[PDB]
Symmetry: C3
Subunit: 357 residues, 3 copies
Amino acid sequence: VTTAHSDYEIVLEGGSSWGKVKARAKVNAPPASPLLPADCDVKLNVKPLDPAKGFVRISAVFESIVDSTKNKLTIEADIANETKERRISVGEGMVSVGDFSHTFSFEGSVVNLFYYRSDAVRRNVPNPIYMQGRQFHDILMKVPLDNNDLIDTWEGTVKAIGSTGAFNDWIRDFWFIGPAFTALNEGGQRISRIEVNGLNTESGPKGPVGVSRWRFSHGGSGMVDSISRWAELFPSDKLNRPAQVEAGFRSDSQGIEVKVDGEFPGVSVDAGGGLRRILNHPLIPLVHHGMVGKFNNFNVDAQLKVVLPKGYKIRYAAPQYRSQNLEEYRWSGGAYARWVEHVCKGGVGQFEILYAQ
Amino acid sequence: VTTAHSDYEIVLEGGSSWGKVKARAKVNAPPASPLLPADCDVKLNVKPLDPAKGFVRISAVFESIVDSTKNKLTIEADIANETKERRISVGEGMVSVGDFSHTFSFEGSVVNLFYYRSDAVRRNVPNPIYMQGRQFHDILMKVPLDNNDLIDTWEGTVKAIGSTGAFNDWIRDFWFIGPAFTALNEGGQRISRIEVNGLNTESGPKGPVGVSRWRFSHGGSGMVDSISRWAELFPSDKLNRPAQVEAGFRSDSQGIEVKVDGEFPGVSVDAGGGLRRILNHPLIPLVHHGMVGKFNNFNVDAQLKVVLPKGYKIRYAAPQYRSQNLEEYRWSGGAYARWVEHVCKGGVGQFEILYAQ
Amino acid sequence: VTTAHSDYEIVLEGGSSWGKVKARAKVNAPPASPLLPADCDVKLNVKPLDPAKGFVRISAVFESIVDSTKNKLTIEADIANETKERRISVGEGMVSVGDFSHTFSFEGSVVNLFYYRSDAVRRNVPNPIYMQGRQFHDILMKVPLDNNDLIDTWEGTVKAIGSTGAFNDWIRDFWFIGPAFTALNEGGQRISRIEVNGLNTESGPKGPVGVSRWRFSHGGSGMVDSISRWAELFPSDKLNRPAQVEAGFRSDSQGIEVKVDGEFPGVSVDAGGGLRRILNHPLIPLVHHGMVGKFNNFNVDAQLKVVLPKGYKIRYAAPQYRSQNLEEYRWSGGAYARWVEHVCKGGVGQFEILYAQ
Ligand code: BCL
Ligand code: BCL
Ligand code: BCL
Ligand code: BCL
Ligand code: BCL
Ligand code: BCL
């Protein structure tokens, strides 16, 4: 029988939206990857840089093995809000695949805009979900052309841009490789044609550098969390100490195994009336994973454990928890099991938890 | 276990395409709504107004409660065919959400056009399904700007239209909220950019009125019933007395419960050769519901009852009925059960019923 | 219970990428066709014409019965590669539906272009799958206007082209009938507006002929095999004798039954290191069938038999085979059964088989 075994745990901090999240999962069904096996490890870290100007330093490392090819991507960036709609970033990183690698540095800004703002909606809807909007990226990137492969790609690109009028359109076929293209529509997401503002070869300290300045916008009909939850997804103001997440998966023709461990702020939020809630589930991950969650029938063997800070209690949970031991609450079987099956297949049915002192 | 229990009943009138439809359904699986609970009641009524000019008066009321917010929409309209391709309407209604509400009045015409008409298809295909075409809307609407929220929205819009060249394009991200966007492609449906022909503030008897005149077209590759079955979906010529439908659902994290009761013309149609059929199932509802029907495994406990007028008998049914008692025919289990599972998940496999005297 | 019973067999030739493929399948679940019943037979044949210029002659016959309407399409074409990116074709055929039929002749070229070519990818990825690109069609077609239906359609079209500026856009709604439209996005595929280069009525030996010259391009994000595997899908260089495939299905409200039998080159390919593999599974068929494979729950009763040439053995298989008798290997149950369920529902998880002497 195909069985998914999972275990999730959330330990909340008092007052502080911080939480520790742990997850383990294993399913004996094949992944929908046309190249197997595929293993990946991810490590994310962020630390307060300069709280006066709202800067944080984020670092990410992705490492994987796909059909015997070793890949790696690292990125380090400094990010800050300038206004409520405009955020800026500056960073550098590296990509490496087998014997090949290249570096890059960049600076960019993103402006997030909602299509409407209405007090009539605001005062009448206590927990608004869909927020339609558009987000603008303005990027400057630099890559040292220090090997023949880079030179070839740079020259090929400069040739294409200057010869093909549809380049700004067709580039999207290249960018959203494989089923990434398909996922755009699934999430109510649109990518505009790009605008190329400048392409130059500079003379760097150590050699020629390919410099490019370009922009694009991305629209969302309300499920794109990047747009609808712009402020909430970057809780820089609550980052009083370093946060981190380590996650990884191993997969082949027999099954998938995953592990996650992290601690960061933003896990709980003020729900008003003196109540707090675990944050609303982001929609994108459920909709995108929904594209791969329907290929094998499975049974669910799942459990969730929520540990509240001392003296806090759950005022409302639906689905309902099965047991409680002081501050620890557990869910398993029954309606919780049906909800897990549901979300693993792509459903976004609400699972709400409100707690208070 | 997840079980869907449903009961459907159709009682046909003799000769007259009229029928009474009753449906009850309950499933213990969560709905895919990111806000729960969600309850809704709908009431539709239509009555012959002036049969000489083909006018009917339709009225609709929608009432719901979503996460504790009460919403309501009413609409009343007079509709008539002018030609076989052009239909006109004039009406008014109201929207209300919590402490907020606004009214509106409108007049509009819709022109439905098929991309081709061929006698070679017509004489060779007895029961044609896909009909590709395009439909044009021309709308004039008026809303009294009688509160600050309306004024804010009106001024914001007039500002956007005059400052953003992409407004006619991006408005579509706002219009098709959440997963409504996604459903467009799923049904082979396209919405053009809008055309804004006029935006004015008039001086009404009781205050300023925001007046707008705009158009859009919508294409369909053949599954869009609004286009392919343009004439059949508005049987004004068979409406010799008032028709109505009452329907509603209650839903939360535990399950969904639905009830429908109606009586209206258009349930049966001439199939030629002296035969009649229950109308072909519209495709849109199956394809759209198919987007939410695949998140939980279920067992089917379903029954269908068809009551023919006295002296009529079923000449062909596939799937086959299980039993017959005079004019009453029943379906349950076996192939019918597999067909129900199929359509609830998004399939459009044909279920045909032909009857005759 | 819904059960799918299938049997697949591959017999490989030694050295030669030739293989014989046999498949039988039956499932008692209804097809997603809004018109039933639907039966179809297909016959394909190809033979070396002139190996010096790389020409092959291909012939196809499609015959079906849909809801009692008999349809038939035949096509015969001569095809050759001119370069590695450009292929040319010349042919003729016929379409017939009930009492109607028409012929056609044509000549066209297709140019396939990849968006990038990189040695860094080539040397580091041993078995590349996604290849983004665009394909250009240039078509000249001729149809004798020998009946009133043809004349009507021709005149209607010439009228539309000259009156509607959006014809080159809207024609796509007509072309991708029903759910064919939807399938485009699902496979990461895009069709451009068409370009009409010429529309003329010529005076043929036997009467007026409608002549048209038009083009279109089609983009693919990497799953479109027509683009990413352009060379491999037309193994003209391995066609040393005639190849053929016969296939057909019967279907109605009770189930689907299918049979396939063929022999052709391209079934196995050099995998490097002295190893050979069965070719990578094309992605389109799995993704498109995935749109209809999820409407009924089923159990799998499936078996695969692979017969290698004398003296060859399997060096790697995942999922693993169950048994081996000399050169014959069999798969059934366990991980193979889960893989079948997976691909029948739309998954593309890799099933790899490497063999060698
Ligand atoms: C049988 C039903 C099964 C099931 C079947 C499958 C199948 C089948 C698959 C998965 C896959 C996965 N499943 Mg599942 N899965 C089940 C239940 C679970 C459970 C659980 C029970 O709790 C968990 C935790 C998981 C977890 C996972 C992940 C390990 C994995 C998806 C990886 C991912 O996020 O990539 C997200 C990837 C991306 C975002 C990459 C995008 C790249 C493109 C080009 C886009 C660029 C983005 C943008 C430009 C970059 C942003 C720029 C800004 C700077 C940010 N599944 C159920 C029970 N699962 C998939 C997988 O990969 O397995 C190895 C997969 O194929
Ligand atoms: C450039 C990227 C953006 C950004 C984009 C997003 C987006 C987009 C989302 C979040 C979400 C969240 N972010 Mg943010 N976020 C950024 C910086 C931060 C910082 C910080 C101070 O720098 C913090 C503390 C957080 C914290 C948070 C939480 C409030 C929330 C996740 C809650 C949860 O329970 O997850 C539980 C944690 C897990 C289940 C494990 C996740 C572990 C894996 C390793 C990470 C995901 C990998 C992703 C699928 C693959 C990346 C592919 C790209 C090609 C690289 N973000 C930067 C500025 N963030 C999510 C949310 O809910 O928003 C409201 C969300 O949708
Ligand atoms: C486990 C599998 C389950 C299942 C799982 C689900 C799930 C999961 C969900 C449903 C949902 C629903 N299911 Mg189901 N369901 C099952 C079987 C059934 C059976 C049955 C057995 O007979 C029935 C009768 C139902 C009935 C229903 C409905 C009560 C409900 C869809 C509401 C709707 O139509 O909104 C249609 C809504 C719209 C058309 C709104 C569109 C708004 C957008 C912005 C578009 C504008 C349109 C346009 C501009 C206006 C027109 C202008 C012209 C003037 C006309 N289901 C199977 C057995 N069902 C959904 C729901 O809402 O539940 C509460 C849902 O999430
Ligand atoms: C402005 C809207 C259009 C219109 C648009 C449509 C569309 C679109 C369709 C129909 C369909 C039908 N219409 Mg019509 N229809 C109109 C006016 C009428 C009038 C009349 C004289 O005024 C009559 C008698 C009918 C009668 C009929 C039937 C012939 C047929 C439904 C058969 C059935 O078995 O349903 C069985 C009944 C049910 C299963 C219960 C339905 C109950 C719920 C309350 C109604 C649906 C709500 C919808 C999902 C949500 C609306 C969301 C919008 C945002 C408001 N229509 C007006 C002019 N009609 C359908 C059909 O089959 O076409 C051939 C269809 O697809
Ligand atoms: C319950 C789950 C079931 C299941 C449920 C279904 C359902 C439901 C359906 C099918 C359908 C089919 N299934 Mg299945 N199926 C199952 C398992 C199987 C197994 C097996 C176990 O091995 C097999 C062999 C099959 C085989 C098949 C086929 C007989 C059939 C798809 C026909 C096709 O290819 O049309 C491909 C068709 C096209 C490509 C036509 C495209 C026309 C459009 C307009 C596009 C034009 C293309 C282009 C312009 C022309 C090219 C130009 C160049 C010159 C080339 N299924 C699983 C177990 N199957 C479907 C069917 O048709 O059944 C009769 C269907 O509805
Ligand atoms: C105009 C069409 C193109 C073409 C387009 C494609 C496409 C597209 C694909 C192939 C694929 C393959 N082609 Mg090629 N192919 C052409 C000419 C040929 C010639 C030849 C010398 O003329 C040969 C020998 C082949 C041989 C091959 C194999 C290498 C490979 C199938 C392997 C397999 O196991 O299938 C197993 C066989 C079966 C499972 C049975 C199939 C039987 C049915 C009758 C055929 C499919 C019908 C299709 C679904 C419906 C057609 C609808 C259209 C509207 C007409 N092609 C011409 C030039 N070929 C596939 C592949 O894997 O590419 C790498 C693939 O995706």
